[PDB]
Amino acid sequence: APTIIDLTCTVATCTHSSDFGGVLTLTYKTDKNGDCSVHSHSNVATLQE
Amino acid sequence: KEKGTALNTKAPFGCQIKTNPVRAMNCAVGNIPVSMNLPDSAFTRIVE
């Protein structure tokens, strides 16, 4: 599974709509292409994906 | 012969007058306030 290093997160837009109204982008440094779990540890936000 | 200077060559703010439906055209003064109601089909969803 890919190993992710030096992950820093910045939020592009933030509109607290009922729908998935916020978008953030994750910048990282991987080693192989692959898919893995992404999840927000606090219920202040819920990720669509 | 003693018309004077017509308003065609006097009108301020660059009004040019035409005559038949007598009117002043292209007159540069003031602000037009616009109110616009847009459908959602005329926006673009954030995800796209």
Method in brief: cryo-EM
Closest C-alpha among A29, A49, A31 to residue A40:
A49
DSSP, res A10: E
3-class secondary-structure state, position B7: helix
Q: How far apart are alpha carbons B33 and B11 in whole angstroms?
A: 24
Burial environment of residue A21 by CB neighbours within 10 A (0 to 12, 13 to 18, 19 or more): exposed
Long-range contacts at B43-47 (CB < 8 A, ≥ 24 apart): B46/A13, B46/A15, B46/A21, B46/A23, B47/A20, B47/A23
Where are the extended beta strands (E) located within A1-49? 5-14, 22-29
For residue A13, the cross-strand partners are A23
Chain B's closest residue to A24, CA to CA, is B47
Q: B46 contacts in A (CB within 8 Å)?
A: 13, 15, 21, 23
Query: For residue B25, what are its two tokens?
Result: 């055209």
